[PDB]
Every structure is written in C-alpha cells, then in structure tokens.
Design a protein around this ligand. Structure first.
Ligand SMILES: COc1ccc(OC)c(Cc2cnc3nc(N)nc(N)c3c2C)c1
Length: 186
C-alpha cells in the first residue's frame, strides 16, 4: 500500500447523500474524474483498493458493482460475509488496513481510496498518519440527510494545485463545482 486518500463530492451545506442517493442530478464528468482518480495505479501490476460503508455499496447502481479495476472492500459490523459482487469485508478501517499487510494484498495494492460514507470518512480523518482529501465542491445547496465532517484547516492544508486535477470552476447541468486537494500529516 502506497497512499491513503478519501474522495468525496459535497454540496455547500456539506451534504453527501439523500436517502442513499446523490442529492444532485448526475455529473457524468464529475463521475469520470471519480473513476479516473480511484482506478489509476501509480505502479504497474498494481491496482488500488477502494473502501466503502455498507450503505455506499448499496447506493451504487448494481450494474456498476463492483467498481471495476479496483479491489472492493465493504466495511461493516453487521455483515457476516461480503455482499454479492464485493471482494472483502472488514469490521473497521484498521482491520481493513491490517489486511493490506497480509501477504494477501500486501504485494497487490498501490493506493487506498475511501469513497464514503460519513462514518468511514470521519474515522479516516482521525487515523493519524498522512492523508489527502480530494473534495469536489458543488457550489449550491441540496437537501441532504447525511454530511461530510468538518475539515480542520489547522490540520489540513488546501494545496494551491495538484497534477491531474483541474483548478477552475466546472459546469454541468447548470450546477458549478470545483476540485480541491487537502493534505494532512500528523
Ligand atoms: C451516493 O449516491 C450515488 C449514486 C451512484 C453512485 O455511483 C454511480 C455513487 C458513487 C459516487 C459517485 N461519485 C462520487 N464522486 C466523488 N467525487 N466522490 C465520491 N466518493 C463518489 C461516489 C461514492 C453514489
């Protein structure tokens, strides 16, 4: 395992989901960027590991499951086995990390990506160590029922830029958004 990262799209109210769905219409290019960031390995013969809560897994259209090109890990305490189409099940992020160390994925994993939900992000955001947040800011309010936790600027620095990430305002379906990379180490 190389790097530990979290990727999220968030509305101005810090909304990440509404009844397990996206609180905004589809954003095909925001989606393509998500697929591109998470799938791309920085080391031949390696694939990235994607981690998600039970509920983020079930919110992905059946058709898109598993996220292809990546090892899919579902994080749950109630599940006794991995949902159909998933590859591994861990009780916590710590257990999910340890598994990496097993010669199991040890030699097979480049980067690890946390793709949801608040719980899983909240807990990654507290794992001590180096972490990067790839945030997609949707520049409007959307009714939500679940939120991203508060980013601590005394801890994470917004990078002035990052290679492979557009720096300017994007626009799809009359909804503007921008990409931000935060970095922490502690
Ligand atoms: C959350 O509601 C849905 C519905 C469909 C769906 O994938 C097809 C998803 C997954 C999805 C999509 N875009 C993202 N976009 C970003 N930037 N970050 C995410 N973590 C993310 C996720 C988890 C989430």
């Amino acid at each position: 395992v190389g790097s530990l990262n979290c990727i999220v799209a968030v509305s101005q109210n810090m909304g990440i989901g509404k009844n397990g769905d996206r609180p905004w219409p589809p954003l095909r290019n925001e989606f393509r960027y998500f697929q591109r960031m998470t799938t791309t390995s920085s080391v031949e013969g390696k694939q990235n590991l994607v981690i998600m809560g039970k509920k983020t897994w079930f919110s992905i259209p059946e058709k898109n499951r598993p996220l292809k090109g990546r090892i899919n890990l579902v994080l749950s305490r109630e599940l006794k086995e991995p949902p159909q189409g998933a590859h591994f099940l861990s009780r916590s992020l710590d257990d999910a990390l340890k598994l990496t160390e097993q010669p199991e994925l040890a030699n097979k994993v480049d980067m690890v990506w946390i793709v949801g939900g608040s719980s899983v992000y909240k807990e990654a955001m507290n794992h001590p160590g180096h972490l990067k947040l790839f945030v997609t800011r949707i520049m409007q309010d959307f009714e939500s029922d679940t939120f991203f936790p508060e980013i601590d600027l005394e801890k994470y620095k917004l990078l002035p830029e990052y290679p492979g990430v557009l720096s300017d305002v994007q626009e799809e379906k009359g909804i503007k958004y921008k990409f931000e990379v935060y970095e922490k180490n502690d």
